[PDB]
Design a protein around this ligand. Structure first.
Ligand SMILES: CC(=O)N[C@H]1[C@H]([C@H](O)[C@H](O)CO)O[C@@](O[C@@H]2[C@@H](O)[C@H](O)O[C@H](CO)[C@@H]2O)(C(=O)O)C[C@@H]1O
Ligand SMILES: CC(=O)N[C@H]1[C@H]([C@H](O)[C@H](O)CO)O[C@@](O)(C(=O)O)C[C@@H]1O
Ligand SMILES: CC(=O)N[C@H]1[C@H]([C@H](O)[C@H](O)CO)O[C@@](O)(C(=O)O)C[C@@H]1O
Lengths: 183, 186, 184
């Protein structure tokens, strides 16, 4: 029994794709400790998504994993960009899969039907000094079916119409938690 | 051996209708308390049944209180209690091991840190996938830590509040809720 | 192989949050590093002029400054002039002897090479007011916003007091934040 972290590494490329177009830089870290997995994530919109307006359409960024906890090539965030294990003691991304990667996955029996957590997602919070009307929502959906994925994690960005105006799509550090899979 | 110290107490998956109000089973409560090195993470979700299947904006607030004794044993007298499934989750499987160990105390909220009651009030989305996170489909859930109840040494209270935020009748199918507190010393 | 460590103020902190060299807030701060992430667990109680806060309250930051070894410096709003050190597993003491392990509680400098933030709800007097929606402010954690010669900073910035419906005891909820911990 050991902890394990899967992540994008620091300074991720534009690795969030909508219609195969790179539009969002996603820092994603999945850390499994004894029983629970902590999702630690942040996002920076690029190009057409650098600035979001109150009329921005909602969207999902879905990660698809196989039965062994390996990130598949077909999600919005996928294995074509940097993804792998974080060794304790350095900031590298180790791409070679281990059986242990399954421990970062959402427990299939606990999440046998889809689960969700919708939380505030502050945008550009330092520069707008946390103005209430500069937050959207980001909902994590756990194990909503997608393709032939065994596990899915979806980051769904919602309620842009709560924004008072155009806002730089520079998210806060977001945290979610779920029960990890058994080896 | 820091790896020797973590412990998880939980209901197991697919809990029964194990949340009681006035001795009537009304809510299915998935509760997981995971102690790692120092902090305990509460991971919880709830599904209303019977008259609590759907909640309206005029719904009265309520507490689901878990009472624990000084050894971290869930007592039989709370709204969520030891008459239903509760015990340790072994690393590597989804069983519930009901035989109390002294290690169970490590999942409790530290008596000195929480020598007077503490709280965290947070958003509690209802039916979030089906309503696509509509802002007016959230209530609040407040975790109260060590508010006295009877002779419990520790208490954890899930208090559901601010149903008047809801735009209408909503399925009482909560998000996965997370809270954190300082764990008790062995 | 992971090595957990907790740095904290201990329970019942003194008035250890200073604004303009005046002690105004009792700050309970716990930084707990497990395998990869640090969990910030904190709560605050105002004293004197900050005992009660009103909708007209000006925003403020409580900054913790740490050096390259993860040792709390003397120059932040929360600083090494008050109780701060390691929490031993099994008791509630505060051990002041610095170790190479203290760096593990710091925000990873490569991950947070520019400042990061998390703005979250901060309920005030929540049990007494029964969680009334108009009794919350916000608390934003800012990670590694530059200050002085600190290598790492953690800033608790209290904001949006105008969300309050009136004078409210500045007795915060238990607040939690998470960030990627520094490498040994
Ligand atoms: C209640 C109060 O004094 N509020 C002040 C606030 C505090 O004095 C301070 O945050 C305590 O640490 O200070 C404010 O102004 C800041 C400046 O003093 C600082 O030089 O630069 C800061 C930005 O980096 C900021 O402008 C504040 O925190 O906003 C002003 C506020 O009224
Ligand atoms: C900006 C945008 O394209 N939004 C559209 C999204 C995205 O294409 C996908 O979520 C990306 O994965 O798809 C929708 O079905 C949705 O999720 O509600 C409709 C929405 O208008
Ligand atoms: C739906 C309901 O019954 N609400 C009532 C609750 C519950 O009976 C208990 O919280 C269950 O433990 O009790 C109250 O005293 C309370 O907590 O404010 C009054 C409230 O009207």
């Amino acid at each position: 029994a050991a902890p394990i972290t899967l992540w994008t590494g620091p300074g991720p490329s534009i690795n969030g794709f909508i219609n195969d177009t790179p539009v969002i830089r996603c820092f994603i870290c999945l850390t499994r400790d004894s029983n629970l997995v902590t999702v630690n994530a942040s996002f920076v919109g690029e190009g057409g998504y650098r600035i979001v307006s109150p009329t921005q359409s909602q969207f999902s960024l879905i990660m698809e994993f196989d039965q062994f906890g390996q990130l598949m090539s077909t999600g919005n965030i996928n294995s074509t960009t940097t993804w792998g294990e974080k060794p304790w003691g350095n900031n590298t991304v180790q791409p070679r899969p281990s059986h242990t990667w399954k421990l970062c996955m959402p427990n299939r029996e606990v999440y046998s039907t889809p689960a969700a957590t919708i939380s505030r997602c502050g945008l550009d919070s330092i520069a707008v000094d946390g103005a209430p009307s500069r937050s959207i929502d980001c909902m994590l959906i756990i194990n909503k079916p997608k393709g032939v994925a065994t596990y899915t994690l979806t980051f769904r960005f919602l309620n842009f119409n709560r924004l008072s105006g155009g806002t730089l799509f520079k998210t806060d550090v977001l945290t979610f938690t779920y029960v990890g899979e058994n080896q």
